[PDB]
């Protein structure tokens, strides 16, 4: 079996062509391959598959080191786009792809970066889902230790964005869990902590739904910028600094889709018989 190793902002993936190859991995095999000392070594596994839909170009699944399939809006999108391009699985500039959760359109920029069309941000509370009487630019959320103000929005997945003075000392450890599993968020939520440096630059930390804080949560960068723009604290093109690295977010407001742009790097190609 052939595979490629790639990385994008804090995460390193093993990407496999599951289109021209029939691939299957027991959760066990995945755990073995993810092991950095006895296996290939990687944070997540990405399989490119047929879409079984004449309107899409591809589909792809992501598995964590535990061998479980996961659905994180936008995750692995850039590595996927560069992989199908490099491997000649497609030659289009705009690629339609579906993930376990939703759909996306990827654009391979001339500068070699990947621009992801994340669609229009969803504000209606009920559609997030988030329990609230009506829409608000800033919602009052009570937690056992503090009442916080936050913007709430959906990029397919639920988001809670709290602004903080200093990203390094923000109480992510305690507020993250309290927000992530707050009652007013029926299906749980991704809790973002945003420090605004200026109208076109922010630093972000995310306590991902069910996974906690990691090196980078793209959909989180999207939500944070969307909220900031909605509140009038940010311009329409913003650089987001996640722990793993930076992303560029562009959103022209309601009626427009939000774009997320970043890099994806090919490292090497491998062959392994399972």
UniProtKB/Swiss-Prot annotation:
Residue numbers binding substrate: 11, 44, 64, 74-75, 157, 190, 208-209, 218-219
Reactions the enzyme catalyzes: (2S,6S)-2,6-diaminopimelate = meso-2,6-diaminopimelate
Organism whose genome encodes this protein: Haemophilus influenzae (strain ATCC 51907 / DSM 11121 / KW20 / Rd)
Site (Important for dimerization) residue list: 268
Name this protein carries in UniProt: Diaminopimelate epimerase
Record keywords: Amino-acid biosynthesis, Cytoplasm, Isomerase, Lysine biosynthesis
Gene (UniProt): dapF
GO annotation, biological process: lysine biosynthetic process via diaminopimelate
Pfam families assigned: DAP_epimerase
Subcellular location: Cytoplasm
Function per UniProt: Catalyzes the stereoinversion of LL-2,6-diaminopimelate (L,L-DAP) to meso-diaminopimelate (meso-DAP), a precursor of L-lysine and an essential component of the bacterial peptidoglycan. Only accepts DAP isomers with the L configuration.
Entry similarity comment: Belongs to the diaminopimelate epimerase family.
């Amino acid at each position: 079996m052939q595979f490629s190793k790639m990385h994008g902002l804090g995460n390193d993936f093993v990407v496999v062509d599951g289109v021209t190859q029939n691939v299957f991995f027991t959760p066990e095999t995945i755990r073995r391959l993810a092991n950095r000392h006895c296996g290939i070594g990687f944070d997540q596994l990405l399989i490119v598959e047929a879409p079984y839909d004449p309107e899409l170009d591809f589909h792809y699944r992501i598995f964590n080191a535990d061998g479980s399939e996961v659905s994180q809006s936008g995750n692995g999108a850039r590595c996927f786009a560069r992989f199908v391009t490099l491997k000649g699985l497609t030659n289009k500039k705009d690629i339609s792809v579906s993930t376990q959760k939703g759909n996306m359109v990827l654009t391979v920029k001339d500068d070699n970066q990947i621009r992801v069309n994340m669609g229009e941000p969803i504000w209606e509370p009920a559609k997030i889902p988030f329990t609230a009487n009506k829409f608000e630019k800033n919602y009052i959320l009570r937690t056992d230790i503090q009442t916080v103000l936050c913007g709430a929005v959906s990029m397919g997945n639920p988001h809670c964005v709290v602004q903080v003075d200093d990203i390094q000392t923000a109480n992510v450890e305690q507020l993250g869990p309290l927000l992530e599993s707050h009652e007013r968020f029926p299906e749980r939520v991704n809790a973002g902590f945003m420090q605004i440096i200026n109208k076109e630059h922010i630093k972000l930390r995310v306590y991902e739904r069910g996974a906690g804080e990691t090196q980078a949560c793209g959909s989180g960068a999207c939500a944070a910028v969307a909220v900031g723009i909605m509140q009038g604290l940010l311009n329409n093109n913003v650089q987001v600094d996640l722990p793993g690295g930076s992303l560029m977010i562009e959103w022209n407001g309601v009626g427009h889709p939000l774009y997320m742009t970043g890099e994806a790097t090919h490292i090497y190609d491998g062959f392994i018989t399972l």
